[PDB]
Design an enzyme around this catalytic site. Structure first.
Site, short mmCIF file in Angstrom:
data_model
loop_
_atom_site.label_atom_id
_atom_site.label_comp_id
_atom_site.label_asym_id
_atom_site.label_seq_id
_atom_site.Cartn_x
_atom_site.Cartn_y
_atom_site.Cartn_z
N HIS A 1 43.09 42.46 42.38
CA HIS A 1 43.45 41.25 41.64
C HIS A 1 44.80 41.39 40.94
O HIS A 1 45.39 40.37 40.58
CB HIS A 1 42.36 40.92 40.61
CG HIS A 1 42.27 41.90 39.49
ND1 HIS A 1 41.55 43.07 39.58
CD2 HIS A 1 42.80 41.88 38.24
CE1 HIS A 1 41.64 43.73 38.44
NE2 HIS A 1 42.39 43.03 37.61
N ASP B 1 37.60 43.06 46.36
CA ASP B 1 38.67 43.37 45.41
C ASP B 1 38.96 44.87 45.45
O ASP B 1 38.66 45.62 44.52
CB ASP B 1 38.29 42.89 44.01
CG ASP B 1 39.48 42.82 43.07
OD1 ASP B 1 40.31 43.75 43.07
OD2 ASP B 1 39.59 41.82 42.33
N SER C 1 40.85 47.72 34.47
CA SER C 1 40.89 47.45 35.90
C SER C 1 40.73 48.74 36.69
O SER C 1 41.27 49.78 36.32
CB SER C 1 42.20 46.76 36.27
OG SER C 1 42.35 45.53 35.58
N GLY C 2 39.98 48.66 37.79
CA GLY C 2 39.70 49.83 38.59
C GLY C 2 38.71 50.76 37.92
O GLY C 2 37.53 50.44 37.81
#
Lengths: 237, 286
Positions: free
Chosen positions: A41, A90, A186-187
């Site tokens: 994303h 994603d 994120s991740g």
């Protein structure tokens, strides 16, 4: 990370933070010293030109340099079947132009082989640089928390998400709350203890707040996309 | 009198805890507290001396470190009725009715919930207006109690998505800490404050549906055409008080006429021989 503690400088060499415009935005993990596994994303159209990206490894507190002493990203490969509406598939891969030789506190994580026979309520750990309680700033120090794996059928309940989880995506966290990742994580490496070796089977894609009731964490499943990474690595070389 | 009590009542079993059956014939006590209630046929085995059953944790707990005797007796089914009244205060505040069950059926509790004074199974209707998915009913809660805690949150693309607490039911909820209704265990000589109420069927004035009350069951108590009723006798103190028994002085209550024997008639001691005679000079006080 909410309700966790500061991560001691042990041996967790599978967390790489990506910095763009001299500020931290999203992180990632490494499996081989030729690629970077992270979310997709943050690889949208406004985030093009992968030449303006750097990666840091073996850095707990995010203050050791200024616009330097990093690894430049050469090319980034994203999943072609990516949807921005439902946020499915994603997973993105970033390739570094540096050999990234192994040294102290530098050890990647192996990909999970098909047929792991994981336990339903399996214990896992999370880590990242996010808010503290709610809508906070980037954490200066590294913190970690312990989360559990919840079932997909229970995650698809009408009072939790009302059937909004794809079969190629799983859920992990606590239904009671107080243990969840906020915006900015994120991740993130989601590993578990099995056969005295950690396995990366998680990838944060999105989320609905943190430390909230009936809102568990969201972590992607790489068991289906494991073959895609091998295919991309074979096509690159 | 213990003998008359066990004779006039169809006693099935008489056992006590931390007390012997011999020292209760002629001694004195300070006070005696008796507790009685029906015995369900399903949970009949839960009345043992120490058990983590539904009765001993939701209806009535029997203490172990106290001198309390358990009495099991039966009652004929002729001219008998069962009163099923809810001792809860906050449940009847919102319009609680009756179980509406058949005769010869008792109601036993299995899950008891305790709530504070600031509690109202009702939401503010001015906030539920901006809800589209899983919209709970709302009404006007009386003053002094806060409304139902509901928040508006968007997950991916649903703007009007409202979530509340106590989901799905307070008996089995995913977040007991967020729901104010918490499970409680009754103590020594304490009743249940109330049962769980489904907030999805509540709500003019906030009136919950009578079918939203969960955490109870019912079963008959007829055995050999007789009903089983529990009885607990608790003795407070020993060798004190002013509550004694007449199991010693009233042993024979029969006198002879022709032989010599001692007597302790009205504090007068002596020996003599008795003889029946017709006398009509005694009064009501002589």
């Amino acid at each position: 990370i909410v309700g966790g503690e500061s991560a001691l400088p042990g041996a967790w060499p599978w967390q790489v933070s990506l910095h763009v415009q001299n500020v931290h935005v999203c992180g990632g993990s490494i499996i081989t010293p030729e690629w970077i596994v992270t979310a997709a994303h943050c690889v949208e159209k406004p985030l093009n030109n992968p030449w303006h990206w750097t990666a840091f490894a073996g850095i707990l507190r995010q203050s050791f340099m200024f616009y330097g002493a990093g690894y430049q990203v050469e090319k980034v490969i994203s999943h072609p079947n990516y949807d921005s509406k439902t946020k499915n598939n994603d997973i993105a891969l970033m390739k570094l132009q540096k050999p990234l030789t192994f040294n102290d506190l530098v050890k990647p994580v192996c990909l999970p082989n098909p047929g792991m026979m994981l336990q339903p309520e399996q214990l896992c750990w999370i880590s990242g640089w996010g808010a503290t309680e709610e809508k906070g700033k980037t954490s200066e120090v590294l913190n970690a928390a312990k989360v559990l794996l919840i079932e997909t059928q229970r995650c698809n309940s009408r009072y939790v998400y009302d059937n909004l989880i794809t079969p190629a995506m799983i859920c992990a966290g606590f239904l009671q709350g107080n243990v969840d990742s906020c915006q900015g994580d994120s991740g993130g490496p989601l590993v578990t203890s099995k056969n005295n070796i950690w396995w990366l089977i998680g990838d944060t894609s999105w989320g609905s707040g943190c430390a909230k009731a009936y809102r568990p964490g969201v972590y992607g499943n790489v068991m289906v996309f494991t073959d895609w990474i091998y295919r991309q690595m074979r096509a690159d070389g | 009198n213990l003998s008359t009590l066990l004779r006039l009542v169809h006693v099935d079993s008489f056992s006590c805890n931390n007390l012997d059956k011999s020292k209760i014939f002629g001694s004195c006590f300070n006070s005696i507290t008796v507790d009685k209630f029906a015995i369900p046929n399903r949970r009949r085995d839960d009345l043992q001396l120490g058990s983590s059953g539904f009765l001993q944790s939701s209806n009535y707990k029997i203490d172990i470190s106290s001198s309390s005797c358990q009495l099991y007796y039966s009652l004929p089914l002729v001219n008998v009725t069962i009163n099923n009244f809810n001792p809860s205060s906050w449940n009847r505040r919102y319009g609680f009715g009756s179980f509406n069950l058949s005769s010869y059926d008792v109601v036993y509790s299995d899950h008891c919930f305790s709530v504070n004074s600031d509690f109202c199974p009702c939401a503010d209707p001015s906030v539920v207006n901006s809800c589209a998915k899983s919209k709970p009913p709302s009404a006007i809660c009386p003053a002094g109690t806060k409304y139902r805690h509901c928040d508006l949150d968007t997950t991916l693309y649903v703007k009007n998505w409202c979530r509340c607490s106590c989901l799905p039911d307070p008996i089995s909820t995913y977040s007991p800490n967020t729901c104010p209704q918490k499970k409680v265990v009754v103590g020594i000589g304490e009743h249940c404050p109330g049962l769980g109420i489904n907030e999805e069927k509540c709500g003019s004035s906030c009136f919950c549906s009578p079918d939203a009350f969960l955490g109870w069951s019912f079963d008959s108590c007829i055995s050999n055409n007789r009903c089983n009723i529990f009885s607990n006798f608790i003795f407070n103190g020993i060798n004190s008080g002013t509550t004694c028994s007449n199991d010693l002085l009233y042993s024979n209550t029969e006198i002879s006429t022709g032989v010599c024997v001692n007597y302790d008639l009205y504090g007068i001691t002596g020996q003599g021989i008795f003889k029946e005679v017709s006398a009509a000079y005694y009064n009501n006080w002589q």
